[PDB]
Amino acid sequence: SSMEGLAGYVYKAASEGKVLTLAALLLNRSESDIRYLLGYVSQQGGQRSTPLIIAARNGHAKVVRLLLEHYRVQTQQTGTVRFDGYVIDGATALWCAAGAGHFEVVKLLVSHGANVNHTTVTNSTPLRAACFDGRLDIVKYLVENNANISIANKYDNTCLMIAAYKGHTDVVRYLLEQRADPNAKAHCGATALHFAAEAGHIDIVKELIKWRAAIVVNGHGMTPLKVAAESCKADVVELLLSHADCDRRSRIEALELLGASFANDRENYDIMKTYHYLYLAMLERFQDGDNILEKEVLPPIHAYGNRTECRNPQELEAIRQDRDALHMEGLIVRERILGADNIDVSHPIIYRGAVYADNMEFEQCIKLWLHALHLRQ
């Protein structure tokens, strides 16, 4: 294993950007020695990589150029790399360079014929890796060099989807300009509009609407409007409710879900907005006195204080000043609108329980937590 130490030294020189040291090590070695030294998969820091892969992941463009131009390195050799916390299996030098944002390395590899549409184990492409970071320059360079924009990953997630969820408005608009399908559905049925609605990316929502993205009901029984309402995205709900192709019951359901979600969200608590949206929805139920849109309220449950959801504007006005009643009403409405689907509806329940516990209402906290654990089956 004497050559194994030289292979380790080659890997070190490549990883630390010592292109002169690497050139000295590789010079005049036999072809078999060159192949062994440059194909040795070194394991280090949870990563498994060849000198080319580690040089591309660290952005050592001189080392990459040397290995490509003067030593005929396999441009498709794969390895395992770690980005922050997550690990990626079956990643090429080009995928690593795209994910790390090394534009010069991406150019050097693409110009030497690197497979631009290589897929990792999760079927991730260099284009998807660059879309995650939001590097519009790298996305453009890849797309121009025949990078297939329509290749999805393990869960049928698209580059448009990942860009819309991360808030990269420029990348989203560019992808839509390059004829990317805005109505592509994930494995569950969710769309890029679904992803952008939950994250509150208002500009990306506007852009997807301008490109005539269809409103669809995913496998969880949710529209983009319904997802925005559950996530307390008041601006996204206001924007989507201005779209005329939504029915009256959908508008009322969105308003009620938004108001109810405003009452038990850890990071978006707003009791005023809770009552505002709930009362608006109730008022819109009672417009035409002849044809009232009556709500089919669920039977009471013990964990919510045995309370029943308000059926009429007067009943809703009764609890306007009762903060606990409004919290319980929020939980009740969220269970009514979302309980019929496969949705983990338990986080606001756990939050309400914890809030009760910090105020020494251990019995009500335990009731809430018991009901939350019960709802998970």
């Binding site: 990942i162 994930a186 992803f195 995913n218 949710m222």
Partner: peptide, 15 residues
């Protein structure tokens, strides 16, 4: 945190 391979919050993937 959620799995980066699918951005749907309503799915249940093993991270």
């Amino acid at each position: 945190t959620r799995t980066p391979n699918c951005n749907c919050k309503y799915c249940s993937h093993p991270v």
